[PDB]
Nucleic acid binder design. Sequence first.
RNA 1: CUGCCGGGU
RNA 2: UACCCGGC
Lengths: 182, 182
Amino acid sequence: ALLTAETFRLQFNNRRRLRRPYYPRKALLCYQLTPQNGSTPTRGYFENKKKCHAEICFINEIKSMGLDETQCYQVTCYLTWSPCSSCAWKLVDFIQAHDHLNLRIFASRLYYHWCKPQQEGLRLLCGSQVPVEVMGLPEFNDCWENFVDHEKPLSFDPCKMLEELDKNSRAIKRRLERIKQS
Amino acid sequence: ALLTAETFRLQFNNRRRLRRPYYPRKALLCYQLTPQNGSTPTRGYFENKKKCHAEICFINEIKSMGLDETQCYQVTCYLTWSPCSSCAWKLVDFIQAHDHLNLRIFASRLYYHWCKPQQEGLRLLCGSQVPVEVMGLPEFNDCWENFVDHEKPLSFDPCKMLEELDKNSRAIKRRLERIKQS
RNA sequence: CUGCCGGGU
RNA sequence: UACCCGGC
Ligand SMILES: [Zn+2]
Ligand SMILES: [Zn+2]
């Protein structure tokens, strides 16, 4: 159920440029659903598969759970790659049909942020009740704590690794800010 | 004994970061020897060998050329990569023993220039009657015109290529000047 | 695909 | 993930 600590470090790695050994930074999504009646959170994670994308895999998962439409839920997502233009649309739709869910999205990296469609896509999310932010130490902290297996001994220092995501996320944050006001 | 236009273009490319497709930018030397009386120049080019770098296979084979010790010669070298710390030591040793030769070096790119032993080697040449400069539009012009065959039709426009070479050499020149000041 | 740090689109 | 650029 739990991501391996090496999967976390490699896949959430928001570095400017990769360090050797090189590896594909795959899409990955960490969601957590909290009811607002004072209740227990539910968690899981998705990759890209079949005819999906992790966001689309997660939209249909919610539908499966058959939630309580009389209840507001807080839905938080942690994406290594900020969403598609196409997934942007499919998410804006989804949230419009499910007003009883409060969606918030955090990206570790901004996917093709120099292209207009991905730009418009993110401005839309932020215009259509779906705030988009860059993960910072708070979000990197919560994702490590609750989504990563901590039973085995690590080949690296977790606190320094988190330190470095925090540091790298700053320039990624100013870039997202500039996109919103364009 | 004429480089092909594709070899010149690939090997003397001074872009900081390459473009696809990727290829090894290997060491290469184009040399010109001219006397001070008037006699026409002598030209050739050298590659890295297993037992000598281009600069060193070159100064070696000078004994085996039809020059005499009573005339002065101006020796100009055009290098893709700037000299070794090891080659720097041997170039100064060689110039010191041959007072009939006036050598000056021109590098397209600075080889490992963030490293002290390579920088001291460049400082050493400049301080030992061996001027080191970064190749500019004149030197790129010079080397294209005299050292590569212009029979075949080119798959690219040599004017725009030299234009970018000239544009790229500006930052690299600024880097050599800083090194020469430490 | 010489290495590193950093800014911006 | 692409490009432009600065410095070491
Ligand atoms: Zn998508
Ligand atoms: Zn050498």
